[PDB]
Design a protein around this ligand. Structure first.
Ligand SMILES: Cn1cnc2c(-c3cnc(Nc4ccc(N5CCOCC5)cc4)c(C(N)=O)n3)cccc21
Length: 287
């Protein structure tokens, strides 16, 4: 399950794909088969013991869904944990929309249906993703949509920095999460709000209030009179898209619909939503 060797023994490391609080991701090629993979490297600390690593690796290996990037294996070498996973050729939806411009309503509908399928699985497994945003939803060359990981709980190494990162960038978090370090707590329905913000992000190239200082956003979003965000151009979008934003962005978590409930919403249960819509989007990259 966890190899005691340098990942360089089995893989040719190619370009750095990106990074963040979750670690550094590299594109790699299997030396024998020639197949491409992604390797995420995380620096281990004196508290990351192998018993805890073993426990978290078994969860990484058993949490499997078609809409979540598949785990392939792992290596622990010179205080660095490397996680081998499926390679998503087109990168994240953020990498895509920062070239193509805004996604169409149908493209957003398909992405939301695919993400809701992933979230419904994670929630049935008593997990909360807590990291839904365009940069964390990956696309392969076939137009398939996959969550980069199962969220903040998939983090082995530097978990606290990743868990607290939203405080400096809270734009995608539900009001109940933004009320950090207060009595409230939250549940899996915070993921539904984050999916609603993400649908705005794909339509507008940034989440609502992205230009506002993160500490002012935390302050406003948790005020009693906070009005949940809306799409900026009423006319460009249909009544179904406006309603999907209205219900996913319900301020009270006790009134917000579940991932399974959202899967029957008119926007995501409509005919013709398939990977072909994202193949059309990836063709825009060529020009
Ligand atoms: C939280 N979080 C966010 N991202 C991840 C990832 C992660 C990140 N990037 C990936 N690939 C990738 C990135 C960029 C591009 N370019 C294409 C051409 O335009 C420029 C961008 C291509 C592929 C992959 C993967 N599996 O392939 N995974 C892994 C783990 C956690 C994560």
């Amino acid at each position: 399950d966890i190899f005691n060797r340098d990942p360089r023994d089995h893989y040719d490391l190619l370009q750095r794909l990106g990074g963040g609080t979750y670690g550094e991701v590299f594109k790699a090629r299997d030396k024998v088969s020639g197949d491409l993979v992604a390797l995420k490297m995380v620096k281990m600390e004196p508290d990351d013991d192998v018993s805890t690593l073993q426990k978290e690796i078994l969860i990484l290996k058993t949490c499997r869904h078609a809409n979540i990037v598949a785990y392939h294996g792992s290596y622990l070498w010179l205080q660095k944990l490397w996680i081998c996973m499926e390679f998503c050729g087109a990168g994240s939806l953020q990498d895509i929309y920062q070239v193509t411009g805004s996604l169409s309503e149908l493209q957003i509908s398909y992405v939301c249906r695919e993400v809701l399928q992933g979230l419904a699985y994670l929630h049935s497994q008593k997990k909360i993703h807590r990291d839904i945003k365009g940069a964390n939803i990956l696309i392969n060359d076939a137009g398939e949509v996959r969550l980069a990981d199962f969220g903040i709980s998939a983090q082995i190494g530097a978990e606290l920095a990743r868990r607290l990162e939203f405080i400096g960038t809270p734009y995608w978090m539900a009001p109940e999460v933004a009320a950090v370090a207060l009595k409230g707590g939250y549940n899996e329905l915070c993921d539904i709000w984050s999916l609603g913000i993400t649908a705005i992000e794909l339509a507008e190239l940034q989440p609502p209030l992205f230009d506002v200082h993160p500490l002012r956003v935390l302050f406003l979003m948790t005020k009693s009179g906070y009005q949940p965000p809306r799409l900026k151009e009423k006319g460009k979008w249909s009544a179904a898209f406006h309603n999907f934003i209205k219900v996913t962005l319900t301020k009270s978590p006790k009134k917000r619909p579940s991932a399974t409930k959202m899967l029957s919403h008119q926007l995501v249960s409509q005919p013709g939503l398939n990977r072909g819509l994202i193949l059309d989007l990836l063709d825009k990259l060529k020009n």
